[PDB]
Structures are given as C-alpha cells and as structure tokens.
Amino acid sequence: GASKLRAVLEKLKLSRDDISTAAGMVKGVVDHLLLRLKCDSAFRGVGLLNTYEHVKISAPNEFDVMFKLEVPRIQLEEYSNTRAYYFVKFKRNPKENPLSQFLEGEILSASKMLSKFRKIIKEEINDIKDTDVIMKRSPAVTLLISEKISVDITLALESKSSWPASTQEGLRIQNWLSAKVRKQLRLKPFYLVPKHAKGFQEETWRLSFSHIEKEILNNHGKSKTCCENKEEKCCRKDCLKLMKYLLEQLKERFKDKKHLDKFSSYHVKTAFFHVCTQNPQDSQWDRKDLGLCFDNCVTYFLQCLRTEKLENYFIPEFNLFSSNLIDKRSKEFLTKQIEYERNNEFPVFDE
Ligand SMILES: Cc1ccc(-c2cc(C(=O)O)c3nc(CN4CCOCC4)[nH]c3c2)c(Cl)c1
Ligand SMILES: [Zn+2]
C-alpha cells in the first residue's frame, strides 16, 4: 500500500548531505563566472536567478543554474503562432542599449548572444584551476566538475513587463491557491530562454516561468497553514518526489535503447500541477492517502502520454506532448513501461 512508498522517500532523505556538499561546488564556480561576465559591456546586468537558492535539481548529478539579463523596454513579436516561441524587438530608441551588439535590424539574435556567452565562459573555465571544470557539445552551457557533477547553465532574458497574451488562461490556480495569489504571481517578471523551434530557427526565444515553481511548492495548500502542524500534513511534495524518481529510474533502466531521451522532470512537474488543479482541496492530498494520491498522478500522466496531450501549465495552447516534440512511438513505449509498474505495485522502487 502506502508503506512501500514511505521507505523510498525516507531513503531519498539520506542522500541530502551528499547533494549539499556538491551544491557548494556549483555555487563556487558560478560566482567566478558572474564576476567575469559583469566586466563585459553586454553582460554587465547579468545576475543569478533563484529557482538550494540559485541551484535547481533535474537529475541526481545534474544541476540547472539560470543567469538573468535585465532587458528594459522590450517588445515581443509572436513566432509562427507557436504560443511559446517569440522574437525580441525594442519598443523605441531612447538611449542605445548595451545589448545592441547582437541586433539584426530590429530582431535580437539568440545564436549571437549565446555564442559570446559560451566564449567568455570557455575562457574563465581554464582560469579557475581549483576543480576540474570542462564544457560539453541543447540551448544550455553544460559543465562537468570532478567528472561527476554536471551543471547546465542557461542564459535568460528578464522582462519585468506584464506576461504575454498566450499566458492569459494559464496558471489555473484560482480554485486552489486563489484568484488573489494568481494576480500576485502574474505581477512577477517573466523569462525568455534561447530554446529554438524545430534545421532550427536560432533567433526565437521560449517563455520560461521556472521561478514560479518555488513560489507554489513552498505554499502549496488551499489552507494557509498546510504542513505547518501535525494535523494539516499533506503529501503534495511527496507525490512530486515519487513522480520525479519514477521517470528518473525508468530513464536509468532504459538507457539500453535511448527511447525516453526527450522526457524530463519538467513533463512530470507539469502533469503533477495539473492534478493539483483537479484536486484543489487539502483533503484530496492527505498523508495517509499517499498511495491513492500517487496513483492519481500516475493515472493523469498515463492518460497524458496515451492522448498525446500535456498542456504547458502557463501556456494552455502549447502541447508538450505534440507529434512535433515527442514521437508517437516514445509515448506508447513510456505508456507501456508505467502501465507495467502501476499493474505490478511499482517494482522499480524495491532497493
Ligand atoms: C506551478 C509551476 C511552476 C513552474 C513550472 C515550470 C515552468 C518552466 C517553464 O520554463 O515554463 C520550467 N522549465 C523547467 C526546466 N527546463 C526544462 C526545459 O529545458 C530547460 C529547463 N522547469 C520548469 C517548471 C511548472 Cl511545470 C509548474
Ligand atoms: Zn501541504
């Protein structure tokens, strides 16, 4: 029942200290690069984005880090009705921006900016000889510290402006976290990561709302006091940790023929939060009900792959499971693998 799952989560608690020692290795290298970039003309307004504060975790030895660049008076042009991919233009010309180095008429190049960013890092990488830091061959700068810790660095354009139109019906937390909280969150800035649409269109930026996850996860209840006492203990966080570790273990047992390469913890998060919308009450996430609650996430995720539909939590018109992003075969393969786990009381957790 719920007994087996608790031991898995209690096991995952034991590796917190090993992740904490490796976390300081990430922040050390990252702070040197931030000092190096600030001395440059274009990367003077570079800062660390808090998404472990500024260090986000995707896999056990993978660490996603985000560098933000303040872009004032930014005008966005939507690309090919994709709803998430956009072009970066400038409202007017009051006093020429320092970002003009990568401009191409009106449109700001994503390929040109990421290239100078890759160059300034490649130069600073060989400088700090304290730890073995390298660079790998994908809109991120991957580093490898002590031939084990992989750090995916991403550059993002910050816009303090009102969120784009495609996000109008997104973040459907009204019946869960409230209309008050939705309005509050939508007052926060948004990000433009250089993810390119399928060759590629290397001048299009993707809408990123990564920074909102910590806001919702650290305040996940309908009741303001959720998980603040022994009475209101819920299992929302435990179901997300079990959903993340499920895909993680399936990506480990099937690196045999590389079918699940397109799948990330991101797809698992999106699906979990959609269940959080479906189940807005705290009584639908009780600590005793861990087994039942996890199965609700497992059923929704299986229904997602099966229907080839998983809406971006912020952009409903954007389908993360479209034929264009992940092929029909990879979804039908993952459907079959999870279906086997669900029908056999999850044998990929027995360790
Ligand atoms: C309630 C809530 C809040 C935030 C997110 C959320 C959003 C984004 C996003 O960007 O909108 C994102 N992005 C990541 C990691 N990226 C995967 C693709 O490659 C680059 C790294 N996790 C992400 C997580 C979700 Cl689901 C739900
Ligand atoms: Zn809770």
Side-chain angles (χ1 to χ4, degrees), residues 23 63 97 106 128-129 164 200 208 214 255 281 285 290 295 306 310 324 332 334 350:
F63 300 90
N97 54 295
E106 286 170 50
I128 306 299
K129 296 168 190 173
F200 283 83
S208 192
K214 56 166 253 174
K255 59 182 191 179
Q281 320 297 328
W285 297 94
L290 181 63
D295 213 64
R306 225 179 283 272
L310 177 70
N324 190 242
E332 285 193 345
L334 194 56
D350 282 297

Short mmCIF file of all heavy atoms in Angstrom, two decimals, residues 23 63 97 106 128-129 164 200 208 214 255 281 285 290 295 306 310 324 332 334 350:
data_model
loop_
_atom_site.label_atom_id
_atom_site.label_comp_id
_atom_site.label_asym_id
_atom_site.label_seq_id
_atom_site.Cartn_x
_atom_site.Cartn_y
_atom_site.Cartn_z
N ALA A 23 26.59 20.93 -3.84
CA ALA A 23 25.90 22.21 -4.09
C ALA A 23 26.83 23.41 -3.95
O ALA A 23 26.69 24.38 -4.71
CB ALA A 23 24.71 22.35 -3.15
N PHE A 63 22.58 19.72 -12.31
CA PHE A 63 22.19 20.94 -11.62
C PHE A 63 21.92 22.09 -12.59
O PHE A 63 22.86 22.60 -13.22
CB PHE A 63 23.24 21.34 -10.57
CG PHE A 63 23.49 20.31 -9.49
CD1 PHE A 63 24.46 19.33 -9.65
CD2 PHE A 63 22.77 20.33 -8.31
CE1 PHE A 63 24.70 18.38 -8.66
CE2 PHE A 63 23.00 19.37 -7.31
CZ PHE A 63 23.96 18.41 -7.49
N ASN A 97 20.84 50.72 -26.24
CA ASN A 97 21.02 49.63 -25.29
C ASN A 97 22.38 48.91 -25.42
O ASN A 97 22.90 48.82 -26.54
CB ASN A 97 19.86 48.62 -25.42
CG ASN A 97 19.63 48.10 -26.82
OD1 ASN A 97 19.27 48.83 -27.74
ND2 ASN A 97 19.83 46.80 -27.00
N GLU A 106 15.98 44.94 -36.20
CA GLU A 106 15.06 45.16 -35.07
C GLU A 106 15.11 43.94 -34.15
O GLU A 106 14.95 44.09 -32.94
CB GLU A 106 13.61 45.31 -35.58
CG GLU A 106 13.28 46.62 -36.26
CD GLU A 106 11.94 46.65 -36.95
OE1 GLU A 106 10.93 46.26 -36.32
OE2 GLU A 106 11.89 47.06 -38.14
N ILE A 128 40.11 29.22 -13.39
CA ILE A 128 39.94 28.67 -12.04
C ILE A 128 40.31 27.17 -12.05
O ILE A 128 39.49 26.32 -12.41
CB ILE A 128 38.53 28.99 -11.42
CG1 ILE A 128 38.21 30.52 -11.44
CG2 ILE A 128 38.36 28.39 -10.02
CD1 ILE A 128 39.18 31.50 -10.62
N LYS A 129 41.58 26.89 -11.71
CA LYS A 129 42.17 25.54 -11.68
C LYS A 129 42.02 24.83 -10.32
O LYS A 129 42.72 23.85 -10.05
CB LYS A 129 43.66 25.61 -12.10
CG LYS A 129 43.90 26.06 -13.54
CD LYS A 129 45.37 26.38 -13.78
CE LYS A 129 45.59 27.06 -15.10
NZ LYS A 129 47.00 27.51 -15.25
N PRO A 164 2.97 37.83 -21.49
CA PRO A 164 2.37 37.82 -22.84
C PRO A 164 0.98 37.19 -22.91
O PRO A 164 0.63 36.35 -22.07
CB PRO A 164 3.39 37.04 -23.67
CG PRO A 164 4.68 37.18 -22.93
CD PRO A 164 4.27 37.12 -21.49
N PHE A 200 16.80 24.45 -37.32
CA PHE A 200 16.20 25.28 -36.27
C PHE A 200 16.08 26.76 -36.70
O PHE A 200 16.73 27.18 -37.66
CB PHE A 200 17.06 25.22 -34.99
CG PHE A 200 16.98 23.99 -34.12
CD1 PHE A 200 17.72 22.85 -34.43
CD2 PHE A 200 16.24 24.00 -32.95
CE1 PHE A 200 17.67 21.73 -33.60
CE2 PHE A 200 16.20 22.87 -32.12
CZ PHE A 200 16.91 21.75 -32.45
N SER A 208 9.70 31.22 -20.30
CA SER A 208 10.04 30.44 -19.12
C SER A 208 9.46 31.02 -17.83
O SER A 208 9.57 32.22 -17.58
CB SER A 208 11.54 30.24 -19.01
OG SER A 208 11.83 29.25 -18.04
N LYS A 214 9.05 27.32 -7.11
CA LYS A 214 9.43 27.50 -5.70
C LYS A 214 8.33 28.26 -4.94
O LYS A 214 8.02 27.89 -3.80
CB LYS A 214 10.81 28.17 -5.56
CG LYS A 214 10.95 29.52 -6.26
CD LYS A 214 12.19 30.29 -5.80
CE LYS A 214 11.82 31.45 -4.92
NZ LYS A 214 13.02 32.11 -4.35
N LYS A 255 18.29 3.17 -20.76
CA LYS A 255 19.36 3.89 -21.46
C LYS A 255 20.00 2.85 -22.40
O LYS A 255 21.03 3.09 -23.05
CB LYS A 255 20.38 4.50 -20.46
CG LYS A 255 21.08 3.50 -19.54
CD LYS A 255 22.02 4.18 -18.55
CE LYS A 255 22.89 3.17 -17.85
NZ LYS A 255 23.83 3.81 -16.88
N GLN A 281 -8.60 20.77 -2.99
CA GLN A 281 -8.72 20.60 -1.54
C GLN A 281 -7.54 19.83 -0.95
O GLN A 281 -7.00 18.93 -1.60
CB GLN A 281 -10.06 19.91 -1.15
CG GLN A 281 -11.31 20.33 -1.94
CD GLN A 281 -11.71 21.79 -1.79
OE1 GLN A 281 -11.50 22.42 -0.74
NE2 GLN A 281 -12.30 22.36 -2.83
N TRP A 285 -5.26 15.29 -0.63
CA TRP A 285 -3.81 15.10 -0.57
C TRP A 285 -3.34 14.69 0.83
O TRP A 285 -2.20 14.96 1.19
CB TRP A 285 -3.07 16.36 -1.06
CG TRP A 285 -3.34 16.71 -2.49
CD1 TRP A 285 -4.28 17.58 -2.96
CD2 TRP A 285 -2.66 16.19 -3.64
NE1 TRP A 285 -4.22 17.65 -4.33
CE2 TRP A 285 -3.23 16.80 -4.78
CE3 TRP A 285 -1.61 15.27 -3.82
CZ2 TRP A 285 -2.81 16.51 -6.08
CZ3 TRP A 285 -1.18 14.99 -5.11
CH2 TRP A 285 -1.78 15.60 -6.22
N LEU A 290 -1.30 8.68 0.73
CA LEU A 290 -0.09 8.73 -0.13
C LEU A 290 -0.17 7.81 -1.36
O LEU A 290 0.07 8.29 -2.47
CB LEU A 290 1.20 8.46 0.68
CG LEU A 290 2.55 8.50 -0.09
CD1 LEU A 290 2.83 9.88 -0.69
CD2 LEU A 290 3.70 8.06 0.79
N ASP A 295 -1.20 7.42 -7.19
CA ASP A 295 -1.90 6.77 -8.29
C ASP A 295 -2.72 7.74 -9.13
O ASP A 295 -2.89 7.49 -10.32
CB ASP A 295 -2.76 5.60 -7.80
CG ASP A 295 -2.84 4.47 -8.82
OD1 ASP A 295 -1.78 3.86 -9.12
OD2 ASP A 295 -3.95 4.19 -9.30
N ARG A 306 -0.94 8.72 -23.49
CA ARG A 306 -1.97 7.99 -24.24
C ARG A 306 -2.74 8.87 -25.22
O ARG A 306 -3.02 8.42 -26.33
CB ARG A 306 -2.96 7.36 -23.25
CG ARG A 306 -3.33 5.94 -23.56
CD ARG A 306 -4.30 5.39 -22.53
NE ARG A 306 -3.64 5.03 -21.27
CZ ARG A 306 -3.11 3.84 -21.02
NH1 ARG A 306 -3.14 2.88 -21.94
NH2 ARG A 306 -2.55 3.59 -19.84
N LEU A 310 -0.37 17.19 -23.14
CA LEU A 310 0.19 17.71 -21.88
C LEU A 310 0.43 19.19 -22.09
O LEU A 310 1.43 19.59 -22.70
CB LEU A 310 1.46 16.97 -21.41
CG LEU A 310 2.14 17.51 -20.13
CD1 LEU A 310 1.30 17.24 -18.88
CD2 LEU A 310 3.53 16.94 -19.97
N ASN A 324 5.32 16.74 -33.04
CA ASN A 324 6.48 17.55 -33.39
C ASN A 324 7.59 17.54 -32.34
O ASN A 324 8.77 17.64 -32.70
CB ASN A 324 6.03 18.99 -33.68
CG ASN A 324 7.09 19.88 -34.29
OD1 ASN A 324 7.50 20.89 -33.70
ND2 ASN A 324 7.56 19.53 -35.48
N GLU A 332 3.98 5.79 -26.52
CA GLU A 332 3.41 4.43 -26.45
C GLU A 332 4.34 3.45 -25.72
O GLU A 332 3.86 2.46 -25.15
CB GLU A 332 3.10 3.89 -27.87
CG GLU A 332 1.86 4.51 -28.51
CD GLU A 332 1.31 3.83 -29.75
OE1 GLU A 332 2.02 3.00 -30.37
OE2 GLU A 332 0.15 4.15 -30.11
N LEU A 334 6.60 4.58 -23.24
CA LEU A 334 6.53 5.04 -21.85
C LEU A 334 5.21 4.62 -21.21
O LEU A 334 5.22 4.19 -20.06
CB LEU A 334 6.79 6.55 -21.73
CG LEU A 334 7.07 7.11 -20.32
CD1 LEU A 334 8.24 6.40 -19.64
CD2 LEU A 334 7.31 8.60 -20.36
N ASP A 350 11.83 -1.10 -5.36
CA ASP A 350 12.38 -2.12 -4.46
C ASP A 350 13.92 -2.16 -4.49
O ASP A 350 14.51 -2.76 -5.40
CB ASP A 350 11.77 -3.51 -4.74
CG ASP A 350 10.38 -3.73 -4.19
OD1 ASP A 350 10.22 -3.69 -2.94
OD2 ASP A 350 9.45 -3.97 -4.99
#
